[PDB]
Amino acid sequence: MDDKELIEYFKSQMKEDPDMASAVAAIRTLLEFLKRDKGETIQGLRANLTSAIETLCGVDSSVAVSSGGELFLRFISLASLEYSDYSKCKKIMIERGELFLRRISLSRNKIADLCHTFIKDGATILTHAYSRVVLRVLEAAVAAKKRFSVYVTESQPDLSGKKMAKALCHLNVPVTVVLDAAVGYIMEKADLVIVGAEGVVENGGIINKIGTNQMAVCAKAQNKPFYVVAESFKFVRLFPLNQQDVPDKFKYKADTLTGQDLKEEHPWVDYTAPSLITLLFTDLGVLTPSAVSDELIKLYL
Template identity: 50%
Template structure:
């Protein structure tokens, strides 16, 4: 297939997945799109296939969905499918290899789809009756974790920041209220005022960095700093497909494509007047990360990534 057609296919695929399955994570939608590419691929060599996948990934990154999540998931997916036994690589017929990749991809997707349930299970003992939680912005993982706690009979009190500039906290607040969870929408500027009453801070992440820190909706850093100052634990809920091999040193070290949506970046050199979408929260402000691999300390994240990429 022509690369251009492949690209536009991938974009419409990703968009429709995100639209039709409101609970799907960006990462999962990205790897499903990649699997689709594998399924219809007519590539006859590994280099051709690589070019196709490259095209699809860059097409997906050109949408306004979180580039952080798309990059981490795509990198993992491509790493996994390519971990093929040596005798398979020597096969003269590339179709066999494609089939093998397809199979790998499917197993990976099945595993990833279970991630949120696992996170809910691991984090469940951390919520007790009338625990007061502060959360930021809209996060599907946090939502599913809170739902799980609620279903097991724990009455939580959740405070949600409005999370400007897009007020995504409002959506979070509405969803929580719909579930019957006691939720309060608060101003972004009220975090310091509220912190002394909180038992814990719970946030999702767009990407988990090799440092064990996270990239998440702008404002997460200031909440985490405030929580640390007042000795409140900060819990991050994130699927392991969000692990990225990036090592940001400070805020200005975050890749541009993580900081601004593609449509904002398009054709512009000077972004200084734009609001960044995300900030980087260093590991020293994070207590624990709840992932489908288990409960991890920030230090353990880097180790997982090193095990995979060396």
């Protein structure tokens, strides 16, 4: 598959299912590229897949796409380690990739089933930006006959908080939209904080929409629980030390890529340290942040 056809396939996959995650669509596109590959060697296939991953990351700058590409690369490497013959290797790769897609298509249901029991009846939940996983968790909580109130931040500049508020109003849930600046004003009302994640870094922290770090800090100040819901394919092998240690390709969008109305090209993601996170609700279960690194240490090496 050429670069243009890869981009078209990825965009069509995203468009056909709006609820499909970007990382899942990228992994499916990578599997299609593997199926359509013509090479007869492992190294050539690896190079072609790396080029495809670079193309997809150029299309979409989210950490989820990069983590999905890295996961697929590790998957083909694990398949190649066991089997020396390339034909059997490719056949097993195709079968296990189909199984992998089928399994990761059900991550959100497992996350919701595991997480909906943590929402106490008659509680207030504070949320940042839009997140399909959080929406599914709240759907499951509502279906379990639980009444709760929701505060959602506006999440400037794309105002995805209003979209999340409309989605929650569709489910007949009392939802109130607050300003980002008002987060510290409203934390005293929230019983718990639930946010998604665009990627889970090695130490267990997360890389999420800008404004999540200050929400986590305010929650830690008032000793409120901070819960993250994220699928396993969002695990990345990154170890930022501060906000500037996050790679620049993730902070600034694809189309985006002094001292006077500069604005310094407002970042889109920030890093939240694992010390500000109480629990993670992945498709692998309910984990402490320290468990996340384990899933990577066993994945490689």
